[PDB]
């Protein structure tokens, strides 16, 4: 039974753990967005026919 | 008969006896839940994971 309480101590760290990487995953998801759109602004910026004041 | 005397006074070195086993037996009891108990605190610490503050 003494085994038995220290797994009872163990799932407090997988939790947390959960937890942890449940926050990186959703700042991941964010940074992947705004990567998409700086993709888009660095290709419309290379267009040789623009303005200086659009570049 | 002077044997039955003595024996009547073995008795009483055997209920002695008992009383202090059973004192022993207790504070064993208590001692084996508070050992349980701190396996559960040294499994809980060895976490690498912790802030400085929950260790």
């Known amino acids: 039974?003494?085994?038995?309480?220290?797994?009872?101590?163990?799932?407090?760290?997988?939790?947390r753990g959960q937890s942890?990487?449940?926050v990186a995953l959703?700042?991941?998801?964010?940074i992947?967005?705004?990567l998409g759109k700086?993709?888009?602004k660095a290709l419309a910026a290379s267009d040789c026919s623009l303005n200086t004041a659009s570049f």
């Open 1 to 15: 039974s003494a085994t038995a309480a220290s797994m009872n101590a163990v799932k407090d760290s997988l939790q």
């Open 20 to 22: 942890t990487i449940d």
């Open 26 to 30: 959703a700042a991941g998801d964010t």
């Open 32 to 34: 992947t967005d705004l």
């Open 38 to 40: 700086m993709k888009e």
